[PDB]
Homo-oligomer: A and B are copies of this chain.
């Protein structure tokens, strides 16, 4: 009755909604349910901005599962203003690095106050979730700092520099040469409380169809997490993030391009690799029409579009079935 999903970004929050819908959790619950859902959440995008600690992936899961996301825009709070961001721009600090809405900042004020008072991020999340009540256990992949940076050629002096992923995404992406990722702090981090337990005891471990390099990937750089994934008796089912068939055939993933990986279901599959060898996957699900073949990994094409909680629920069901878990 126990599911563990590794998540990051808007895509990860959407996948958890599918999981909740399938198992009657959170907003989809009718009576109190038979299953518990644990999310291991990326902290690679977390940063200190304007003296406050911002954790996007944990916040997006928490807001999404708590029913706080504006349905029209698809991100942020309902009835959101950006007045504090406006005054910051007048002050001269750069505030486009993250949405930084007024309602959003309240979360940041509360979290930063707890962190300064000695509460670890996992407990900070528990405290916020008492209000949001997402219907899932949102575990930060670590309580220690592990921030995704991008190494660029700085155009002001030609030097290699690491830039926080969020600054790279708004300002430098596609505008200067970019050489690699750095996981600043990862080597000094331990897996967050209950993360290795959640991976160890699960009936199944699901990799949401999030960005492989910068959403799932950074979770894997946290010491101990990869080991828990390679050892657990639970089947490990991955979902491909590559959806073909778009107008003009789509665009390659920019973060995959940094590490030189093609934007195909086959390449992302090899990226995570086979548990039978040195990799992470037992199963790899791809969208209708797509193909992959990887020595040791069971691949199945099924509809992989998170159109709505009901479509996402079907996708989760295809994961359980391919694992052989009920």
Spell out A's residues near B (CB within 8 Å): 50-52, 77, 79-81, 83-88, 90-93, 102-103, 105-107, 109-110, 112-113, 116, 128, 130-131
Whether the Cβ atoms of B110 and A83 lie closer than 8 Å is: no
Distance between A66 CB and nearest chain B CB, rounded to angstroms: 11
The 6 A-B pairs with the shortest beta carbon distances in the complex, nearest first, are: A87-B106, A51-B113, A83-B102, A102-B102, A50-B109, A51-B112
Closest to A89 in B: B106
A88 to B107, CA, bound (A): 8
Which of A86, A106, A116 has the most chain B CB atoms closer than 10 A to its own CB? A106
Whether the Cβ atoms of B84 and A116 lie closer than 8 Å is: no
Whether the Cβ atoms of B52 and A51 lie closer than 8 Å is: yes
One of B52, B83, B112, B113 near A80 (C-beta < 8 A): B83
One of B81, B92, B113 near A81 (C-beta < 8 A): B81
Closest to A95 in B: B106
A51-B52, A81-B83 are known; give 14 further A-B pairs, CB within 8 A: A50-B109, A51-B109, A51-B112, A85-B106, A87-B105, A87-B106, A87-B107, A88-B106, A90-B106, A91-B107, A92-B130, A102-B102, A105-B105, A105-B109
A103 to B321, CA, bound (A): 52
A87 to B68, CA, bound (A): 11
Whether the Cβ atoms of A93 and B80 lie closer than 8 Å is: no
Which of A50, A52, A84, A103 has the most chain B CB atoms closer than 10 A to its own CB? A84
Whether the Cβ atoms of A91 and B105 lie closer than 8 Å is: no
One of B79, B86, B103, B112 near A103 (C-beta < 8 A): B86
Whether the Cβ atoms of B102 and A84 lie closer than 8 Å is: yes
